[PDB]
Design a protein around this nucleic acid. Structure first.
Lengths: 101, 203, 31, 53, 108, 202
RNA sequence: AAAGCUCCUUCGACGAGUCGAGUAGUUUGGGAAUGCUGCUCAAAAUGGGAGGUAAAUUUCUUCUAAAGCUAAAUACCGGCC
RNA sequence: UUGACCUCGGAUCAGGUAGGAGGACCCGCUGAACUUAAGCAUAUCAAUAAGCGGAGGAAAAGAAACCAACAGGGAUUGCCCUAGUAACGGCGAGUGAAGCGGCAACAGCUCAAAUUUGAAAGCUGGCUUCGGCCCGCGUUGUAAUUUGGAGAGGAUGCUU
């Protein structure tokens, strides 16, 4: 950690202490991928397939209309970041389907 | 500014039971002390520093000791609540000083602790022997292990030869410079990266 | 309709192990 | 009932002091239960799987 | 009391911006001038310093322990070197401390 | 085991297999009664994580409730007061349809305690729920320390008082600055803030 | 037979018509930052929520929702003393 | 033909349970107008009265998807203060919290998501000579173990 300057204002302000390096708390592991949940999610994706809105976005991505796909994903899901993540996931499944074919 | 436009008389709370409630609280405290004797009536609490910039000058009692503090003081987390020590798993030790102070506090408590055996006929090696179970005892950990020095000492004497030179340029100028640099962090970074890009383009 | 004393005082095995090996201790603090 | 008889015969041998390894042997049975069978399939210990209609 | 009221006598004759989620602890910074600076020294030691029985020592005053964050510059100081530790300081206060022969140290 | 797969599959509610199952089961549940006993949970993973056990004293009841808003029962659908600038079609009930379903199931089985409930289906007219109930008079329930808290009389009709999960959601019992008015009980907080407190030595 | 402590290559499952978004009503000091409910859409895996001004990019800090229990200090124009 | 599952039924079958009263206080739902704003559809009265459902000796809440921005605090509740403050408000009458801080009181935990798989180790009920034996529930999962503060696998030598 960066040492504090000992001043009340400016960059790195605050009282000087000897900062410690903590062992990482187990409650902050959430979001990390596990082998079992990765295997189960891949199998369930294979068994179930895709949603109609996902089919629309993957077809737009196949035609390469990326901006319209992002706009349609944002309209369907609600937020720009979730739309971007969904479009990246659909890009990855297009790439694996093409490397299979 | 009088807020009497509702039906305020339906929910007027008087406090004519203040001495009676004090007497009730004192009776409950006596009963709790008699039930817990010879243990103290309260648990051991750590020393923590108050948050925000208004109250960080002062220390006070916290909820409980951290797991790192207990591990450094050599007390297992399952034994700790059974011998009068409060345990708080949410609090962390971001700095060495508070950790060291609380470990010293726990070591002092463990040095002054008397531990009676579970069975009288069969004392164990971790238990206090019968010739050491007799001593003068305290019943208030908030008094015997309180916050001794809540604030920093406001007055200290140093020799005239040890007077510091001070910040070069002046303390007021140092504060103004720190504020100005903080306000101009991003502008200078944009200018530096633009200059670097121009140098890369026309090297 | 109240629960019987045995059923109310019945406890789980993990709690039983915890109370077996770490009960509330009788202790005092020197002044 | 067969399990109870096996436990009683093994208890007689332990009462005599003989070893459970000496008196008993590895069992071989059909594995059932949904979570158990799924775990066996994932750990590749299953040779054949029969799924109900 | 009712007996003193006049009714008993009259018996028979009738801009800018809006700050959402303001936290005052951000803006907490009490100030003290330099003419009250020597009052923070304990009384006997202050009398010794002002009389001149301590010519080889200097008092160090932490304003944050007394509850003050800024040292302001109203008044004048005696010619005694004092170390002052403060979070904030005004230019005139620092200048007058420097004329008195002390230093203003910045803390957080 | 299998229930991880069932949870991942129940996430994907717009796949072909899940929509087919939802459609055929919705037709079946529409042909059945409004409240009827389910012999086993149709979502075993959801029931298990909400607290259902395959033990005597646990029952599942399936219930359908009419969805949409709430209508004020005034004559001819009109009130005779000040203008409201809105009709009775746009009035919103403050509890959930899940709560309505739980309360009706509790009235149907008044000898049991509602533990939890979960969505199973919906259509244009109804929402379909399954409610887990526990028998507080069964010996297998009374001998289990993980569940015998529900035998105590303070848990009589939790669904009527809002002590279930949907009730806590509707009462807004969460920590933080977004739940200032409701985290300790809205009416209790209001009474505290509108109580005039006068001490002896004022 | 169970149980604690110490160290560690590795593993480390964590709740979905739910979160979130739009809209309408109601509510709030939170009529730019509140909650609840109905309708429509509908998630993810260092992901998600929050960080009281809308948005994109890069960071940071805190926690870990959608399952559950639990005494005390608090209230009391009803009942009994 | 004979039987097994699954689903749905019958019984004055065996054993249980609910209703009503009370409702000062408590948890929800539903919900005014007089009044105050010159009148008045925003507003105020008031998220109140009346109406409905549900508890107890207290209830509720409660062990952070918290507060913060600090040298960081650390479940809930209540008092004092914060504070008539930040903020909201036709044509303005008015409305109005929270963190920190002092105190009273303090107490922590249980599941789902793992195969016991070298042995459903779990449980209701019936009959008893009170030793047990039966009929069943349950593998679409009852015990032991684990709950993020971690834990699982190892290694290690002492303690209970």
């Amino acid at each position: 950690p960066v040492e504090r300057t000992g001043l009340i204002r400016g960059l790195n302000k605050g009282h000087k202490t000897t900062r410690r390096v903590l062992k990482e708390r187990p409650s902050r592991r959430k979001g990390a991928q596990s082998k079992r949940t990765q295997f189960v999610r891949s199998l369930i994706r294979e068994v179930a397939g895709l949603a109609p809105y996902e089919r629309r976005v993957i077809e737009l991505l196949r035609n390469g209309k990326d901006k319209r796909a992002r706009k349609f994903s944002k309209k369907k899901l609600g937020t720009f970041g979730r739309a971007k993540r969904k479009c990246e996931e659909l890009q990855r499944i297009i790439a694996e389907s093409r490397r299979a074919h | 500014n009088n807020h009497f436009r509702k039906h305020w008389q339906r929910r007027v709370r008087c406090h004519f039971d203040q001495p009676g409630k004090k007497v009730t609280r004192r009776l409950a405290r006596r009963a709790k002390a008699a039930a817990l004797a010879p243990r103290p009536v309260d648990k051991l609490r750590p020393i923590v520093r108050c948050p925000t910039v208004k109250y960080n000058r002062r220390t006070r009692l916290g909820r409980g000791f951290t797991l790192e503090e207990l591990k450094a003081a050599g007390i297992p987390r399952l034994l700790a609540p059974t011998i009068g020590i409060a345990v708080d798993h949410r609090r962390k030790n971001l700095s060495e000083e508070s950790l060291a102070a609380n470990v010293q506090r726990l070591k002092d408590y463990k040095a002054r602790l008397i531990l009676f055996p579970r069975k009288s006929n069969k004392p164990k090696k971790a238990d206090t022997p019968k010739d050491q179970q007799t001593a003068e005892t305290t019943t208030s950990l908030r008094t015997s292990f309180g916050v001794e020095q809540p604030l920093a000492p406001g007055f200290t004497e140093i020799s005239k030869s040890e007077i510091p030179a001070g910040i070069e340029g002046g303390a007021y100028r140092a504060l103004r410079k720190a504020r100005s640099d903080a306000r101009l962090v991003g502008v200078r970074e944009k200018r530096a990266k633009e200059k670097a890009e121009a140098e890369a383009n026309k090297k | 309709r109240r629960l019987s004393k045995e059923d109310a005082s019945r406890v789980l095995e993990k709690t039983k192990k915890r109370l077996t090996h770490f009960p509330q201790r009788k202790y005092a603090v020197k002044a | 009932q067969e399990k109870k008889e096996r436990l009683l015969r093994e208890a007689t041998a332990i009462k005599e002091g003989k070893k459970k390894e000496d008196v008993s042997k590895k069992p071989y049975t059909v594995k059932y239960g949904l979570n158990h069978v799924v775990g066996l399939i994932e750990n590749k210990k299953a040779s054949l799987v029969l799924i109900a209609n | 009391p009712t007996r003193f009221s006049k009714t008993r006598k009259h018996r028979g004759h009738v801009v800018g911006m809006r700050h959402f989620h303001l936290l005052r602890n951000h803006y907490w910074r009490p100030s003290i001038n330099i003419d009250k600076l020597w009052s923070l020294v304990p009384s006997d030691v202050r009398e010794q310093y002002l009389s001149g029985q301590k010519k080889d020592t200097a008092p160090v005053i932490d304003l944050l322990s007394h509850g003050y964050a800024k040292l302001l510059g109203k008044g004048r100081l005696p010619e005694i070197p004092v170390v002052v530790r403060a979070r904030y300081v005004s230019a005139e206060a620092e200048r007058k401390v420097k004329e008195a022969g002390g230093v203003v140290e910045l803390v957080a | 085991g299998a229930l991880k797969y069932l949870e991942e599959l129940s996430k994907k509610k717009q796949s072909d297999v899940v929509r087919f199952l939802l459609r055929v089961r919705c037709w079946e549940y529409r042909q059945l009664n409004v409240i009827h006993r389910a012999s086993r949970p149709s979502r075993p993973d959801k029931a298990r994580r909400l607290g259902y056990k395959a033990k005597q004293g646990y029952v599942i009841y399936r219930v359908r409730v009419r969805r949409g808003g709430r209508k004020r029962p005034v004559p001819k659908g009109a009130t005779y007061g000040k203008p409201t600038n809105q009709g009775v079609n746009q009035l919103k009930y403050q509890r959930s349809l899940r709560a309505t379903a739980e309360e009706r199931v509790g009235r149907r089985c008044s000898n049991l305690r509602v533990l939890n409930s979960y969505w199973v289906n919906q259509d244009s007219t109804y929402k379909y729920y399954e409610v887990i109930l526990v028998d507080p008079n069964h010996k297998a329930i009374r001998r289990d320390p993980r569940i015998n808290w529900i035998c105590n009389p303070v848990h009589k009709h939790r669904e009527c008082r809002g002590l279930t999960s949907t009730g806590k959601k509707s009462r807004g019992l969460n920590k933080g600055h977004r739940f200032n008015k409701t985290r300790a009980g809205r009416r209790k907080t209001w009474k505290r803030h509108n109580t005039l407190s006068l001490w002896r030595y004022r």
